[PDB]
Structure 1
């Protein structure tokens, strides 16, 4: 409908999944708020518009269409008002910085060592499958109370939920172009229910220190628990992004450091630079790239576009983090970029609740990897491909080292 953006009609879902950055560079210049036909929604592409929409009093959270088809209600990302306040109060205790600092080292560091011990003398490894994902999922799984769910299963679940949640393509009539793409999300949920329903059965009667037990019990009247149907969608929110994103952020940070060998050596030699390297990694390839959205609650004008009430806007934070109004040469990883605000954790009342936790998981994992393999090098016989529009990260990271 917007004439000068007719080229957007030829943008495909596969193009955005393989590399959304060329399309979004055009969007940031041509239309910071733009309706993308294959996505069926307005998208915010610049830092200014994403931040404005994420923090505006005239917008509230909305789950994307494929996200809602995947998670249902009440996903913490998709609700507001009293339900959102309750779900935030439910998840926040274990994520409080003073609480994280009590146990994060004893949680993540032995896990990192366990996975490293399997390959650190091999001289070769694919770090996404052998290290970044296992550490991410084993750390969160143990915190949640899923100690008995193997890391290969947690990784399979977040991969299936990822593809279902981002199964966003719509056809010429605005209907989902790929309805079969939700089936593997439904199968993952069915498997999760089979595993987790007995655990909830047990936690209701015998609460323990697992996070999901506290989600059932915290803040409830005596002898009452939150209904499992009320907390399952937020369990799914965790079993997708909370399981997936720390591993993605680790791996993207490593790919960026390998792209700047001098900076990789700097960080190996001085591990106090790991937090800075990670912050730049998150900006450089944002793990949550375009997964969340807001919806207008009254008529509003954003970036010159008059939106009616009830208009969804997708928040493409991964594009906003390449906003050249903010950053010079943003497609280059640069550890020595000044530490500027970024949107990799979102903004507003629905901003990431687990920032402090996630930053420490990533930090500890990279600390242990560099201590165990200080001569780590990328395997240049291998290419690194990144995949994902909703969630983005490298699909493999082949490395080598002299042993």
Structure 2
């Protein structure tokens, strides 16, 4: 209620961003590609051009961090790392995620894992695909590829939730001090248990890109391993869910996919563009004063990269709100770009491909259960909250 971009920006709330992000980002792309949102106490980049320019600029921005990220992940986590520290951390975590390295696991581990949960839901006769199928597949396949084959999914899942709860533990006082330190304790305990597991892919972590006499240590690596458990463990499953949901909005395209599995790589890419799971949670911080258009950002301020809005940018895509398997080919920013580009960007679509291959081979008649609704939520991380389905 009032009695004008700046005026409007001051009224936008986090709850509106969480619940109705698309019309907000539609206005932002048009009126303020880099916008300060007072309720978010941060900048948000909404266009393809602004997101790619900020994300790729290794001279004037650094990878994002925050008090919670320092508290939960530890210092020199890979997200906020730059320079030789970042190059070294990428030298540690990237090798097992390259296609030549993970290729044998696809048929030796991933597809057998998928078929285990496929059989589980087959006995059910129907399913809530996210908790019943996509999430267990994602947790197990990411846990395996990063060298935690011997950690059970129940433990990987508890670690994920403890780290997430810690990142969400933002309550602060006027001095910038956390007021709920108890909300970090599950994350602290998770970190201790990860250390307990690893202290006795892994050999690559210590040695790859390092002098044979100077390997890495566990404390140098633990922040970046927690990054993966927090941010990698669930996202292949989220890609499956965004892709499944998008296909259901185009029945004729879903039908085609169920009769031709070679269309799945394209559907999965369009799924990521249509509902980017990491919608605005990526960020950078200015290293010096930066002015883009009318936005003057200053060192230390948070700049969220709304890759999800960039992937819905009318200047790049025609009718970007529509899922379209036959869309004119174009890259997307759902994995980011530049030096911080997702280390899992080659592995995640292969897990998702095999998960959907097996799903549509066994249940080609699969469809959303019309006795249920599909709630969709979030602007930092965005996706469906469940996917109740039926099949013949």
Q: Is TM more than 0.5 here?
A: yes
- Residue 232 of structure 2 aligns to a residue whose secondary structure is helix
**Higher mean C-alpha displacement, 368-377 vs 146-155:** 146-155
Equivalent residues of 2:274, 2:312 under 8 A apart: yes
Q: Which residue of 2 aligns with 1:95?
A: 97
For residues 300-336 of structure 1, what are the alpha-carbon distances to aligned partners after superposition, in whole Å with 9 as ceiling and x for unaligned? 3213323344544211111111111112222221111
- Residue 233 of structure 2 aligns to a residue whose secondary structure is helix
Q: Which residue of 1 aligns with 2:160?
A: 158
Q: Which residue of 2 aligns with 1:206?
A: none
Q: Does 1:58 align with 2:60?
A: yes
Change (3 A) 1:70 1:201: closer
State the 1:170 CA deviation.
Answer: 8.0
Equivalent residues of 1:33, 1:44 under 8 A apart: yes
State the 1:120 CA deviation.
Answer: 1.3
State the 1:185 CA deviation.
Answer: 5.0
Q: Does 1:236 align with 2:226?
A: yes
- Residue 130 of structure 2 aligns to a residue whose secondary structure is helix
CA distance in structure 1 between the aligned counterparts of 2:78 and 2:350, rounded to whole angstroms:
23
Pairing 1:142-221 to 2, within 5 Å after superposition: 142-166=144-168, 180=180, 183-184=182-183, 186-194=185-193, 196-202=194-200, 211-221=201-211
Change (3 A) 1:14 1:324: same
State the 1:42 CA deviation.
Answer: 1.0
Q: Does 1:27 align with 2:28?
A: yes
TM-score (norm 2): 0.91
Pairing 1:240-259 to 2, within 5 Å after superposition: 240-259=230-249
Equivalent residues of 2:163, 2:190 under 8 A apart: no
TM-score (norm 1): 0.89
Change (3 A) 1:372 1:94: same
State the 1:241 CA deviation.
Answer: 1.2
Change (3 A) 1:193 1:213: farther
CA distance in structure 2 between the aligned counterparts of 1:212 and 1:42, rounded to whole angstroms:
38
Q: Which residue of 2 aligns with 1:11?
A: 12
* Structure 2: 5+ residue stretches without partners: none
Q: Which residue of 2 aligns with 1:205?
A: none
CA distance in structure 2 between the aligned counterparts of 1:185 and 1:269, rounded to whole angstroms:
48
State the 1:273 CA deviation.
Answer: 0.4
For residues 209-229 of structure 1, what are the alpha-carbon distances to aligned partners after superposition, in whole Å with 9 as ceiling and x for unaligned? xx2443134344557642222
- Residue 234 of structure 1 aligns to a residue whose secondary structure is helix
- Residue 187 of structure 2 aligns to a residue whose secondary structure is helix
Q: Does 1:307 align with 2:308?
A: no
For residues 46-65 of structure 1, what are the alpha-carbon distances to aligned partners after superposition, in whole Å with 9 as ceiling and x for unaligned? 11100011112322212245
Q: Which residue of 2 aligns with 1:125?
A: 127
Equivalent residues of 2:241, 2:384 under 8 A apart: yes
What RMSD, in angstroms, separates the aligned Cα atoms of the two structures?
A: 2.4
Equivalenced residues, count:
388
**Higher mean C-alpha displacement, 143-152 vs 250-259:** 143-152
For residues 206-259 of structure 1, what are the alpha-carbon distances to aligned partners after superposition, in whole Å with 9 as ceiling and x for unaligned? xxxxx2443134344557642222111111111111101111110110011111
Q: Which residue of 1 aligns with 2:111?
A: 109
- Residue 330 of structure 1 aligns to a residue whose secondary structure is coil
Change (3 A) 1:191 1:299: closer
Q: Which residue of 2 aligns with 1:83?
A: 85
Q: Which residue of 1 aligns with 2:253?
A: 263
Change (3 A) 1:323 1:169: farther
